[PDB]
Design a protein around this ligand. Structure first.
Ligand SMILES: COc1cc2cc(OC)c1OC/C=C/COC(=O)[C@@H]1CCCCN1C(=O)[C@H]2C1CCCCC1
Length: 121
């Protein structure tokens, strides 16, 4: 439970640490096509998941609902070339319902995210 609370509500749901500093003044705007790599896991340590297992970047449009709340929030704070760690309570992820069989109810998740690039719609 180290790191900066990047939630709107300030409920320590989404905690971030920058591990490697990006560059540019610019963070992605809502609706940018965003290119990352990521290593992700449950905090209980029973499942792991990486962009690298698909040997290709992970692509998604920011704030257009295609990843969990925490990713839309977290990635909008990052600059090109930033590596960050996010620690994510279930309210910002898969909630009490979970997303079986991958994620159990009320799972806390961890990710390491490298923002590779972003381009305007
Ligand atoms: C690429 O496959 C998945 C990866 C994760 C979760 C999934 O569904 C719950 C997955 O199945 C379909 C995709 C869901 C989109 O996933 C997400 O919003 C977040 C952020 C984008 C990367 C993927 N992701 C996930 O929660 C992973 C999950 C997998 C298990 C380790 C913890 C992280």
């Amino acid at each position: 439970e180290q790191g900066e609370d990047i939630t709107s509500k300030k409920d320590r749901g989404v905690l971030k640490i920058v591990k490697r500093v990006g560059n540019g003044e610019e963070t992605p705007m809502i609706g940018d096509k965003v290119y990352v790599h990521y290593k992700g896991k449950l905090s209980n340590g029973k499942k792991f998941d990486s962009s690298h297992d698909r040997n290709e970047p992970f692509v998604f449009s920011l704030g257009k609902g295609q990843v969990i709340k925490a990713w839309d929030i977290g990635v909008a704070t990052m600059k090109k070339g930033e590596i960050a760690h996010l620690l994510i309570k279930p309210e910002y992820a898969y909630g009490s319902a979970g997303s079986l069989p991958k994620i159990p109810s009320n799972a806390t998740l961890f990710f390491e995210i490298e923002l590779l690039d972003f381009k305007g719609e």
